[PDB]
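Teaching note: in complex prediction, the entire set of molecules is handled at once rather than each chain in isolation. The prompt given to students was simply: 'Predict the structure of this complex.' The entities are:
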Amino acid sequence: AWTPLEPKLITRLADTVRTKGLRSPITMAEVEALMSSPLLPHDVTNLMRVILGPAPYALWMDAWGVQLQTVIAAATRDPRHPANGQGRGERTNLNRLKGLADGMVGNPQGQAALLRPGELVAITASALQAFREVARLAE
Amino acid sequence: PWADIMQGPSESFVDFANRLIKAVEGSDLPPSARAPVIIDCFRQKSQPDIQQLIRTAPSTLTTPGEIIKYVLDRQKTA
Amino acid sequence: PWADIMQGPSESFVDFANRLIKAVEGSDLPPSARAPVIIDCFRQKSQPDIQQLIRTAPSTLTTPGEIIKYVLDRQKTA
Amino acid sequence: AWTPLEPKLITRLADTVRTKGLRSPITMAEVEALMSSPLLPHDVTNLMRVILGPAPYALWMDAWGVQLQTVIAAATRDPRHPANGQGRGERTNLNRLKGLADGMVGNPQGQAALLRPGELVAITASALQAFREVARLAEPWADIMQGPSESFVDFANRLIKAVEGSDLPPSARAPVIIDCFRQKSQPDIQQLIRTAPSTLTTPGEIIKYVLDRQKTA
Amino acid sequence: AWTPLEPKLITRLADTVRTKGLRSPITMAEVEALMSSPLLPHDVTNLMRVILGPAPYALWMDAWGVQLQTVIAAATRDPRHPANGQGRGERTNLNRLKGLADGMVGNPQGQAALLRPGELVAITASALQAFREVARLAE
Amino acid sequence: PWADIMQGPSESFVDFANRLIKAVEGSDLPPSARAPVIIDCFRQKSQPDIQQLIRTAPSTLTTPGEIIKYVLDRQKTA
Amino acid sequence: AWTPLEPKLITRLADTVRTKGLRSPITMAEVEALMSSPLLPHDVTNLMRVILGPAPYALWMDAWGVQLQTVIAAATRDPRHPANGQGRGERTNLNRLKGLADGMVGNPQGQAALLRPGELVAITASALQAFREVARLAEPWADIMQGPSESFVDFANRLIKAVEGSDLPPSARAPVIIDCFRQKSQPDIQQLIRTAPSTLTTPGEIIKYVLDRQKTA
Amino acid sequence: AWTPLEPKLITRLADTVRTKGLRSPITMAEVEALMSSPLLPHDVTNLMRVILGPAPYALWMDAWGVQLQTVIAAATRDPRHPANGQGRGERTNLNRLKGLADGMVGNPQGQAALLRPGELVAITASALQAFREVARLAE
Amino acid sequence: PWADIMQGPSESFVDFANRLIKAVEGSDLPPSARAPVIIDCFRQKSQPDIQQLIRTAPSTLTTPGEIIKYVLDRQKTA
Amino acid sequence: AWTPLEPKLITRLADTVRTKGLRSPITMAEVEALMSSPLLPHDVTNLMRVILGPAPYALWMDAWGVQLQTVIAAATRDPRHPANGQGRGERTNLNRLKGLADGMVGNPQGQAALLRPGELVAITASALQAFREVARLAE
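The expected output is the structure of the full assembly:
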């Protein structure tokens, strides 16, 4: 069952990003805090939509896609990925990682249903690395 | 109005990009027409120093984020 | 001391590069840390005209030789 | 059966040569147009008599003879020339090429009778090359500078014209045009080309880059 | 059999380009008119040599080469190109498109002999797109 | 009259050649006597600088076109 | 057995590079002299460390690596390289060329033991080409005119120097030198070259002709 | 086995040519000294590249070619040339004399391998005569 | 004395050649040394106009008769 | 048997050449007169030595050699020359025409012995044409 993040925590994090900036160690610590439980693509996408401005959000979408592509290359380079399965029918496509696959587009409940925990942690680590890249790039 | 936005002589580039993306996304354009418009407004607005900086890009920039990153890297510190 | 080397207002760039590479290679740094230090010293020393010339490089320069070649190509003849 | 060229087309071509000159690309295009069907020696000779003045006509007769002699040397160097035959009795003499052979002198009908199509096309190509030589001869790239007030497209036009209409080999025009763009083209554009983050390896690319990043004034 | 374009039409088109410029809609209409029948590389090359100045002609040679290279990439990406054939022996090289192949250099008759109609229409469309690019670039 | 044509002190050589060939071909001479007359008029008219230029020709010039080409090549640019 | 180069010769070469520069023909001749016997990677590396400054040495390391990579591409494109062998077990890796392979790092004796003579000559030619590139890079022909008072041999020396020490391809230097002799070289020599009864098709022949028939003054 | 000439001797000879000139009897004696052992085309070519300036080097290349052509004419006029052999398969082409033949271009070791001693002495005498001609011509 | 013979400023070339050949053949030189001496005296005497005329000879003149013929052909009529 | 020309006629002809010049029609008529009987190379050579100055004599030697070479080319182009014979053993070399062959050098008697009448008339016509050339060239 999907539970959304508190809008109070999200508002506090947005104001933190607004006053301290993207690169302060306190901001990265707060992001790591709100990046503790494995989030669904819907959660991370809306979180970055709210806390980041338009141009940093575009940059972050780009960087997140690139990092997820590196993850999928490593996944096709190793059939023992915690997102993959043993047979070929469990291979994870980027539509399933970005939340674009069938039964997931716009629906967080179905998303949480079909996604694997390894998928969730890989998406989360990818999003964190992308946030780091964009923060280092913006300023 | 997005089509009336110019980068001022003294304005920085991140402020101009913020203002332009705000006015383009908060307008009556379809969602699939915002990125090309933002790019082509970066290229034709954004006073001729940055215009030439974007023009002479050895790589092809196909996203507002990539253009912003490139310009922030190679901008004239002043 | 390598970290105290600045490009003088009247000094050419090849002399500055020679002096800097000499002081960095004849120092106590490990061999695997000389190239990144030379690059980051080219970027932060080397008075702001060449600083902006290196900053606005459409290509990514990942070697002191490549940076030297680029700067020698596009330098302000004077 | 021999059909003469229209005197209207010949008059228009003569006036074209009179106003534009011998070396203009429009004039060479018009000559290529009137050089489309394989012409008999009579046709080309009268055509050059009408369109060219006396001295260019003398020069053209010389050059045409030289080129035809080169053709006949290649023909004696290969018995499979489309003008030649297999046996030795079909070897083509210069009297047959210049229209001086027996049964051809002054008579275009007999000319068209005895001549081969390979003979006609060889004569035609020879005459075209001779016209090119004389045009290049009748009317300096290393002295061309971009004036202080001149635009860059005019300078590029003038330079490319003078370099392509010169005595350089065809494989040496592009490097010369590039290196003349770099050393001529007054120091603002010189520095603009020097500080090119990309490597420009063609005159067209240099022209495009300069037109993009030029100082609007 | 190869028939050359009228020098009268070419002279009128050259004067049109001289007075109206490269980008006027009347000039593009006239070029489309003289670009009606599929032209051999010799025809288009001489046409652009006559109507364009030296620097626009250099730019146009560059652009034509680039567009022909894109065409050849699409051709190696699809063996059913109207310029290609079914077997590998009919694959079309850029020497055959630019008129540089064997039996074609400087000879328009042999050119018209060996070239395909699909080759001709592809060359013609490429030249038209290159003219459009150069016209948009010159002014 | 062809036999009265001289190259003026300030006239170029192509104008003189044009005038002379015109007057010789539009005259009462037989067709087989025009080329030798044009050559011998190039040699004796065409003021003494070009006269000496034609005289000291290491090759033998046997055609008006060849003489014109030679003189145009080796003429004193002024 | 490995024998080091004399430090006396190396000191003389270093002072030559210090006074004359990297691009002088005497310096390139001296380098060719000390590049006569096939050197081991250790020898060439230490030689360039001593004769070149820090920044030219970095540039030279880069260029040497690039040229060696081109050599290894040609080697994988032809199994008959004098550095390669017939079987796949003799294929030469860049660690063996740069002296980084096993049993070679820092030891010139072991280096000389395992290396092939073809390997040595390929390394040496690569290092020479890299030195040429860096020398051309570390320090304009179309702007050279013969001064009103300058002699012709000085002008020819200056022009040939600037043309050969430039970015032109090797196959484009002679035509450019000729066409610059013809258009530069103030109008007395211009007319002297123009009125040449023979056709001059080489800079040496043009120089000889002009030196013969020049106006003694 | 090929052994290069000492760069010390070459430097001394170059400075001799620089101070005394090309035509002094001491310079010709020094050249005769360094022309004692039969040199390979590589050796003489590099020697003249180093000791002569650019324009004298061009003149010397011309003169050397002419003298070698005279030698090859005498060789085809007499099958008993010390460079030739008895059969027709040993006839010496100018590519073999100028070092342009197969297996010789740029490689002095292979050069020394395939060349004959008569070839070497003929090349050497030709180069000496060419040097004399150029020296008489330069001043 | 042959080595003291100069072509006067107003003297023609055939008179100078006659005088020089006379003095050289009626002297104490060996018979095999007269032609080279006559040639080298034509080249160094024979005032600088004819000197330059002989110098700029596209062909190589290897006989006094050939030099005389060439000079008589290309001489400055005056 | 060889009979020399009268020194009185030769003196009169020399004074004619001295007063009237080389090109006067009276001088050419006198030369044709003294060129009536076929002369041996010795006779014509001494005649031109006496009547011509040194420089015209050099020019005449050159021109005579050239004309004799043209004659010998025509002779090798036709085996029916009145100087030639039918077999190859009668082919006439320039040493026999210029009087340089064996048994002729300096001896007019032996000259008259071995020479053919066709040889004599060819030599005479060649000398006359050479005299005409030199006379046209001298003034």
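Point out the following to students. The helical segments of chain E are 7-20, 25-34, 41-51, 54-76, 94-97, 108-114, 117-138. Chain E has one domain: 1-138.
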